[PDB]
Design a protein around this ligand. Sequence first.
Ligand SMILES: CCCCCCCCCCCCCCCCCC(=O)OC[C@H](COP(=O)([O-])OCC(O)COP(=O)([O-])OC[C@@H](COC(=O)CCCCCCCCCCCCCCCCC)OC(=O)CCCCCCCCCCCCCCCCC)OC(=O)CCCCCCCCCCCCCCCCC
Ligand SMILES: CCCCCCCCCCCCCCCCCC(=O)OC[C@H](COP(=O)([O-])OCC[N+](C)(C)C)OC(=O)CCCCCCCCCCCCCCCCC
Ligand SMILES: CCCCCCCCCCCCCCCCCC(=O)OC[C@H](COP(=O)([O-])OCC[N+](C)(C)C)OC(=O)CCCCCCCCCCCCCCCCC
Ligand SMILES: CCCCCCCCCCCCCCCCCC(=O)OC[C@H](COP(=O)([O-])OCC[N+](C)(C)C)OC(=O)CCCCCCCCCCCCCCCCC
Ligand SMILES: CCCCCCCCCCCCCCCCCC(=O)OC[C@H](COP(=O)([O-])OCC[N+](C)(C)C)OC(=O)CCCCCCCCCCCCCCCCC
Ligand SMILES: CCCCCCCCCCCCCCCCCC(=O)OC[C@H](COP(=O)([O-])OCC[N+](C)(C)C)OC(=O)CCCCCCCCCCCCCCCCC
Ligand SMILES: COC1=C(OC)C(=O)C(C/C=C(\C)CC/C=C(\C)CC/C=C(\C)CC/C=C(/C)CC/C=C(/C)CC/C=C(\C)CC/C=C(\C)CCC=C(C)C)=C(C)C1=O
Ligand SMILES: CCCCCCCCCCCCCCCCCC(=O)OC[C@H](COP(=O)(O)OCCN)OC(=O)CCCCCCCCCCCCCCCCC
Ligand SMILES: CCCCCCCCCCCCCCCCCC(=O)OC[C@H](COP(=O)(O)OCCN)OC(=O)CCCCCCCCCCCCCCCCC
Ligand SMILES: CCCCCCCCCCCCCCCCCC(=O)OC[C@H](COP(=O)(O)OCCN)OC(=O)CCCCCCCCCCCCCCCCC
Ligand SMILES: Nc1ncnc2c1ncn2[C@@H]1O[C@H](COP(=O)(O)OP(=O)(O)OP(=O)(O)O)[C@@H](O)[C@H]1O
Ligand code: CUA
Lengths: 52, 49, 251, 110, 62, 125, 50, 104, 78, 98, 130, 222, 51
Amino acid sequence: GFETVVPAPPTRDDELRMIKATEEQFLQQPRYKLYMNEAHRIAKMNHGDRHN
Amino acid sequence: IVLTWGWSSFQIGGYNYERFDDNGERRNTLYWKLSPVEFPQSKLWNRPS
Amino acid sequence: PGEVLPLRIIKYPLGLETIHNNIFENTNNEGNVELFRLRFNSNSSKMQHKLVQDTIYLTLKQKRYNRKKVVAPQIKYYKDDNGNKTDLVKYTGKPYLSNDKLLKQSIYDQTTQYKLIKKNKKRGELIPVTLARRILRTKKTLVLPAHVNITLITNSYDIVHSWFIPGLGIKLDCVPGRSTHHTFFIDNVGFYYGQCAEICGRYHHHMPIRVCALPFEHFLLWWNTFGLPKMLNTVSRKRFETHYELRKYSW
Amino acid sequence: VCGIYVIHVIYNYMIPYYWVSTPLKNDEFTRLRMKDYIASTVLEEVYGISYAEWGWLPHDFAYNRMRGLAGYMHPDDPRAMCTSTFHRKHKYIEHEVEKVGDYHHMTYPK
Amino acid sequence: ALNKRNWGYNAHYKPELERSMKKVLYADPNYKFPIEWPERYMAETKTLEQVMDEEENWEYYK
Amino acid sequence: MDTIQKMNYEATVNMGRQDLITREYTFYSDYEFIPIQEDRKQQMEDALNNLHKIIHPTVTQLKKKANVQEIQDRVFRKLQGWEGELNTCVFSAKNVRDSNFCADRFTNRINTEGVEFVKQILREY
Amino acid sequence: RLIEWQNESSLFTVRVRARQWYWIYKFELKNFTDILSTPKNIGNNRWQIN
Amino acid sequence: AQTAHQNRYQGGLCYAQCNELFSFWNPSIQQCWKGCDFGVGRVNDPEGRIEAQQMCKRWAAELYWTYKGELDTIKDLRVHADMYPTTPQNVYRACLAGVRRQKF
Amino acid sequence: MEVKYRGPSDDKLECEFLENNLLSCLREKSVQDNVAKMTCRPEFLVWFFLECPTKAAVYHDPKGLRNIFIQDKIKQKG
Amino acid sequence: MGSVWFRNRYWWYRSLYDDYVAREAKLAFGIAAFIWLPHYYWGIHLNRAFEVNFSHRNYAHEWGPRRNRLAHSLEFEQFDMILENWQDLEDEYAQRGD
Amino acid sequence: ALFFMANTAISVPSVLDTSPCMKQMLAYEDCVLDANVPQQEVIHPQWPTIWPRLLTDGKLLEFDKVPFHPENIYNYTYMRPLTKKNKQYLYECEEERFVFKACLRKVISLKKTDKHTSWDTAEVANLQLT
Amino acid sequence: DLPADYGKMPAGYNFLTRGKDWREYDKDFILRTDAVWEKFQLEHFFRNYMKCFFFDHGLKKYQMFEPEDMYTVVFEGWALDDLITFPGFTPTGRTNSYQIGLSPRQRTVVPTQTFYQMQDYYMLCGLRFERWFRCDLVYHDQRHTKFDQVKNQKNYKTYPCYREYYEAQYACQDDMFDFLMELAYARRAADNFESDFASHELTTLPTFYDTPKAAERKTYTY
Amino acid sequence: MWGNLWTEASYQLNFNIGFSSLRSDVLIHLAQWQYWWWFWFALIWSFYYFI
Ligand SMILES: CCCCCCCCCCCCCCCCCC(=O)OC[C@H](COP(=O)([O-])OCC(O)COP(=O)([O-])OC[C@@H](COC(=O)CCCCCCCCCCCCCCCCC)OC(=O)CCCCCCCCCCCCCCCCC)OC(=O)CCCCCCCCCCCCCCCCC
Ligand SMILES: CCCCCCCCCCCCCCCCCC(=O)OC[C@H](COP(=O)([O-])OCC[N+](C)(C)C)OC(=O)CCCCCCCCCCCCCCCCC
Ligand SMILES: CCCCCCCCCCCCCCCCCC(=O)OC[C@H](COP(=O)([O-])OCC[N+](C)(C)C)OC(=O)CCCCCCCCCCCCCCCCC
Ligand SMILES: CCCCCCCCCCCCCCCCCC(=O)OC[C@H](COP(=O)([O-])OCC[N+](C)(C)C)OC(=O)CCCCCCCCCCCCCCCCC
Ligand SMILES: CCCCCCCCCCCCCCCCCC(=O)OC[C@H](COP(=O)([O-])OCC[N+](C)(C)C)OC(=O)CCCCCCCCCCCCCCCCC
Ligand SMILES: CCCCCCCCCCCCCCCCCC(=O)OC[C@H](COP(=O)([O-])OCC[N+](C)(C)C)OC(=O)CCCCCCCCCCCCCCCCC
Ligand SMILES: COC1=C(OC)C(=O)C(C/C=C(\C)CC/C=C(\C)CC/C=C(\C)CC/C=C(/C)CC/C=C(/C)CC/C=C(\C)CC/C=C(\C)CCC=C(C)C)=C(C)C1=O
Ligand SMILES: CCCCCCCCCCCCCCCCCC(=O)OC[C@H](COP(=O)(O)OCCN)OC(=O)CCCCCCCCCCCCCCCCC
Ligand SMILES: CCCCCCCCCCCCCCCCCC(=O)OC[C@H](COP(=O)(O)OCCN)OC(=O)CCCCCCCCCCCCCCCCC
Ligand SMILES: CCCCCCCCCCCCCCCCCC(=O)OC[C@H](COP(=O)(O)OCCN)OC(=O)CCCCCCCCCCCCCCCCC
Ligand SMILES: Nc1ncnc2c1ncn2[C@@H]1O[C@H](COP(=O)(O)OP(=O)(O)OP(=O)(O)O)[C@@H](O)[C@H]1O
Ligand code: CUA
């Protein structure tokens, strides 16, 4: 369908915020759940929670 | 028969070959630095190949 | 079968070419990109032309050495052969390569020397394979550059064969119907002989291979002077044509 | 040991072969590469460069480093992705490269 | 900072002779190279006539 | 001209003249139909050009190939239904009058219905 | 690791065909341009494409 | 193979971010790691970031045949999971993503 | 790569050919290739020095070069 | 080494093969401590030869073209000197005009 | 494996280049590469004299009775005369060229004489032993 | 102090050093004690390495032949054929003496990673030829009208399926390519498109890539 | 023989026991591995001799 507006390339501050968010998510990942680092890791974890 | 001849013959032969035949080097070559190296004997002829 | 329909609507493929980041490759005369094409059939009861073979290969046929009955002298005729051939003879000679790497005129009978060496050559108990190449002679040795990767695609016409070079320690099985790809990398300048290493039939014993890996400059010289002209000899063949090609494509 | 190896070989090579058997309308190349990655990137024929000094001498090590960089220069290569980097010095002694990453060409190690 | 490396980028000529003019031209901050380093390894797009015209109309920064 | 130029010209003309020599060969058992006329061919080409003109702005503005592919697929489905109708009508057509009638119907159907559908889908996108 | 898994990265391609009882070596037309576009090493290990 | 580390674990958080960004079968992770290596010690500098971007341009140009202006005219510099390093544009985009993920 | 040694050939015909090529190159380069046709062969210029040291020494000699130039001018005039 | 590390040497002998060759196994160490020296030294020599060969291969691959280009430039410089002398002679001839 | 070879000859160093003017030649080549002149003849330090026409017309070969059919900028790079930009960026590299030519001239002037007595055993002085 | 225009090329500057004094450049280079020996060794090596041609006393020219084994060169020097005049390494007399490397790769439309596990590449050849024929079924009859095969070669455009053609040629051996070309001829004569015969998508299993919104399926990020 | 550059890589004699050539890197590695294979049999050979 319609395409959304593509934002301009992020600045260094935006990159740092993204890095901090990724670190927070990685820390939030449970230790006993064995999911590989990949683009679908979060989708796989949500699917696993629903399956549980 | 078993140990000393078997473990010293090839090395003795290679040493003598280097002494008396320049490890089979083909002379008339230029610029040894660029030229390939003619290796000493490395295949054990006394051992069963 | 089924006849070509009067009209077909064909979608123009999009994104095949990524040059300059242009999804659309076809633009109408009015300046609008085209997404569809109309193809019309006329004279339905008509033959369809076969696909034109647009594949050009420089082909070298490596066969076992053939004995020479007579050593013919080198003869060169005049140029400007507008006719079938020029009867006039410009130069005729009997060159031979001396130990000084010079092509000097021979004062001996080349045929007599060839016959004598064929019949009663002198051999020895410990004779190097380099000077004893009885069953390892071919023609049109395969010339490659050194210190670079090459993609060798191996195949056979009739049955399974084995391209074997013990000097390089390379054995490639050429099987009919397969397009096996191999990486070939010779890290030195050298000339290697080889034989076939798979029972094939009558001449399994006599089917040699000669591969010469040379520095890229010598390889390029050999290419430009022997192989590149042949790749256009199928259509254009002349000394001036070869000169034009080598001047146009200079490395 | 043989049974575990055969099970791994099956999982990588036999069962995935049957996943795709016809042309695919959507993401055909993506799915083909997904099924081929597990088979073409097995560690048996990928791992080892990390301890290449066991067989490669310093000068031989540098020559093989440049050769491997040329061979795996192709970006589209999961095997190259999983292979250990060639941008390193011989642990015993290095004769050609004094510092890693200080080159005159982003591809050639020298 | 310790792990920072150039990785072969912009590895242009580094003069060693004291009186080489490059040793001063490269020091000059307002020095323009004939072509950018990334473009130095990319295929040309302009036609021969266009390239010749651009080179003829090119003016040295000084 | 030089020898190379003459060879290139000969190659170009021979490549272009494939149909010239292919015409002479024909098959007896063949369901021969009446080819569409040149006027109708030009009219259908003009209709296609009008559709392309209407579609050009939106597709050019779009930056992702997926949306362009979807638009192309939908328009192609419609045009393919109409193409099947035209083919079945023309193949059974017993005269150039019937062929011209079928072509006129097809081009008018394009110019009205396909134009409306293209406008609708482009506005949706 | 050195003598395999490098088909994608090669200077050019040569086709070796075996028949009863001789060999045939074929160089595709693209080999000509591949050889023409070979980088040259000049200077202190710098690479140039002409 | 062409990265700066023997194994991806030796690399810092940038390698993990590249793995998360790209799918496990997508070889753009290697280009992202190259971008990380280029950005090591340069992202935190206004000139260093531009130098890393130019290094990415040069790396893509050396990896694939490319013309002048293509990388400048790339429409979208964003990268998705199924983007492969089959073109100079894709290589450059992956390298830029790696540089962005690079922290120190 | 093993390269076998071989001193300069000093062959009469080869050195004559190389000297003729060198003379043609000198004549053209003196006028800066302002001639109707060009016959320079820099590769043969290199091979002249590589193969015929005696003629190279004669050319380097101020008197030998003067004599060669005088003879060349006489031949060209005649 | 071997059985001595075990506090049940009878069990050590029994559980492996129920055979006793300890006398020969422990008398072989003395001979093995010196039978290897000639092979080791010849192998050191061969490894050095291989290293020299690899270094020569690398040097050739990296510098042979450079040496050839240097020789070509040297010969071109000789020709340049001869050309300068020839130009001087031609200028003198033009000025004099025999 | 770990120590299967049982020894590594780390002492054997990379053979050192001993050519007379290698450094000068490499410096000149790097300067020319920076200049980025499409013509390759510039690699030779004496190009302005070996190919005088490269500065005026660019015709280095006589195309007589041979067709001249260029197709792109990479066909006849040696037939294009140097432009103002190339001339400037080569003039910026004259100091290296002068040093290279001086080194070549010195090497040419140096000659063998009977005074030398270590000529036969010159490999040791050349450091061919390891 | 500098004249503020250092490095500027003087107007009319000529790259000539006819009367230059080289004594001032003596201190800028260092020559080792064995400079004469190095010069002689360089000359010997160049003469014995770069000379693949031989002078002939009959034609007064240099001639060469294709590479031959030592046995042929030595024991059959009096019996040689196919001698060809030596044209030179380069047209202008420059040097081709360089160390070559690997050129940058070509962009790929059909990745080799689809069947990179197999060394035979027969599946990859089939897939590439299928894609090339899909493009050909569109552009074949226009190739001679508005593409490279036009008579007016000045305003020529490259054939759109060129890259697919070259990839298929690389992946396929000549015999397999001939088989596939015969199949392509038959299919074009029948005027058959795979789209009008394909119905296996109905029987193919679903996947996330089959979602009705392919454009919205993908997620983009910097 | 490419001019004075001897390109022949194999000079094996009638009674050759080793590899045909040792210029190739693959053959050099194989020869080194084969030579060092027999170096690690000292203890076993001595034990068998005593037995
Ligand atoms: C055809 C013919 C030709 C051949 C053709 C080719 C054929 C090819 C065939 C290929 C076949 C492949 C298979 C090969 C294997 C076959 C095996 C088979 O069939 O037989 C089964 C055979 C059965 O076992 P075994 O070999 O009979 O076991 C017996 C032991 O090996 C033996 O050890 P043990 O413990 O039982 O008895 C010895 C021990 C017993 O003696 C003792 O009582 C121990 C004493 C310890 C203390 C010593 C010092 C005391 C000092 C006191 C104070 C002195 C006065 C003061 C002086 C002060 C100043 C000087 O004493 C020692 O000698 C140990 C000393 C420790 C050594 C290290 C010390 C380092 C520091 C220095 C200390 C000493 C010197 C300094 C002194 C002071 C200096 C200040 O082997 C096996 O079980 C399987 C072997 C498989 C291979 C790997 C094995 C690894 C495990 C370890 C064993 C390794 C050795 C044996 C290997 C096998 C070959 C020898
Ligand atoms: C003949 C009788 C057959 C009966 C069964 C047939 C019906 C289909 C049965 C499907 C069972 C699937 C079980 C999946 C279990 C996954 C567990 C897991 O966490 O794995 C994670 C791994 C890795 O994924 P991951 O770890 O990233 O996923 C995260 C997982 N959690 C949520 C647990 C953290 O999954 C896989 O690798 C995918 C599945 C692999 C399956 C391997 C099968 C091997 C078969 C060997 C050959 C057998 C031949 C038999 C021939 C018979 C001839 C008659
Ligand atoms: C339980 C049975 C187990 C059997 C295991 C299988 C055993 C296989 C090996 C058997 C070896 C038998 C002995 C061979 C001796 C060969 C010596 C030789 O020529 O030198 C080789 C080697 C070869 O080295 P080389 O320097 O001469 O030549 C090398 C080859 N070239 C030069 C071409 C590169 O030389 C030496 O070892 C030199 C020293 C020899 C000192 C000992 C000489 C002994 C002479 C024979 C015995 C005495 C005569 C009377 C015997 C009476 C017997 C009843
Ligand atoms: C009771 C103690 C239990 C100890 C825990 C470990 C044993 C568990 C039970 C046996 C199964 C072990 C499977 C390990 C590997 C699983 C993953 C896998 O196959 O892929 C990794 C690797 C394959 O790696 P790869 O090359 O596919 O890499 C994947 C990642 N990419 C694609 C990026 C490269 O597996 C192998 O290589 C298998 C080789 C065969 C031999 C494996 C031996 C395992 C160790 C010995 C086990 C002994 C058990 C004895 C039990 C009875 C006695 C107590
Ligand atoms: C080539 C040079 C040598 C290199 C070093 C190689 C050895 C490295 C160490 C290996 C240790 C682990 C071995 C696993 C197998 C143990 C099997 C077993 O029976 O163990 C239970 C035994 C139990 O023995 P036990 O006698 O107390 O009880 C068994 C008897 N019953 C059943 C009646 C109770 O525990 C040990 O004693 C462990 C010994 C470990 C050492 C290896 C023994 C074999 C001989 C070789 C000695 C090597 C010494 C190395 C010293 C260190 C050097 C770095
Ligand atoms: C749990 C499994 C083990 C861990 C994984 C290990 C994988 C990596 C190592 C595998 C290859 C080992 C051999 C390397 C080459 C040497 C071969 C050799 O000498 O064998 C001949 C020897 C016997 O032949 P030999 O008697 O001729 O030995 C040479 C004798 N001299 C010195 C006189 C010349 O093999 C043996 O029987 C002994 C065992 C091998 C040697 C081990 C030495 C100690 C090293 C530590 C071992 C413990 C494991 C850790 C290894 C270190 C790295 C982690
Ligand atoms: C570390 O040391 C070691 C090695 O390193 C060298 C090893 O290689 C090895 C590996 C070695 C091996 C596994 C063993 C290899 C084999 C070996 C040593 C045996 C080789 C033996 C030979 C070559 C000799 C062959 C024996 C023969 C009898 C041949 C014939 C010779 C002779 C003199 C007799 C000739 C007679 C005839 C032909 C028949 C005439 C008579 C008749 C017909 C009878 C007529 C009847 C009447 C009544 C008149 C070991 C074990 C080792 O320890
Ligand atoms: C020990 C405990 C752990 C489990 C152990 C499992 C052991 C499995 C043993 C299988 C034996 C099969 C029968 C014997 C075949 C021997 C010959 C053989 O394998 O031939 C090769 C042939 C492949 O055919 P080919 O035309 O070459 O095509 C392959 C292209 N790469 O091979 C084939 O045709 C392959 C046929 C495979 C059929 C698979 C059917 C089941 C699929 C299940 C999917 C996974 C989930 C369920 C797992 C349940 C496990 C019990
Ligand atoms: C004495 C001779 C006989 C010995 C017994 C026979 C078997 C010997 C086995 C080999 C022994 C050698 C040591 C292990 C190999 C070392 C080299 C190696 O493989 O390193 C590479 C790799 C780790 O690499 P990487 O993950 O990048 O490292 C970052 C770590 N943060 O390596 C790895 O994969 C690392 C694996 C680690 C496994 C840890 C297992 C538990 C022990 C944890 C550490 C010790 C804890 C005790 C307290 C320590 C502090 C006092
Ligand atoms: C018929 C059989 C009778 C019984 C056997 C008697 C011996 C017979 C002869 C055996 C063969 C000897 C010749 C072949 C092997 C030796 C080859 C050799 O020495 O090569 C040189 C090599 C090092 O040279 P490299 O530097 O690599 O090369 C450049 C050379 N300038 O050399 C080296 O590796 C350096 C050697 C240095 C000196 C070593 C001295 C050893 C002394 C041993 C003392 C007693 C044992 C001590 C053991 C301690 C450890 C347990
Ligand atoms: N024509 C092509 N040439 C080269 N690579 C291609 C081509 N088509 C697809 N690819 C590769 O497949 C990947 C997925 O292709 P897809 O059709 O989804 O891309 P897209 O929508 O045009 O945009 P993008 O380049 O962002 O993925 C591309 O990223 C590229 O890696
Ligand atoms: Cu052909 Cu065996």
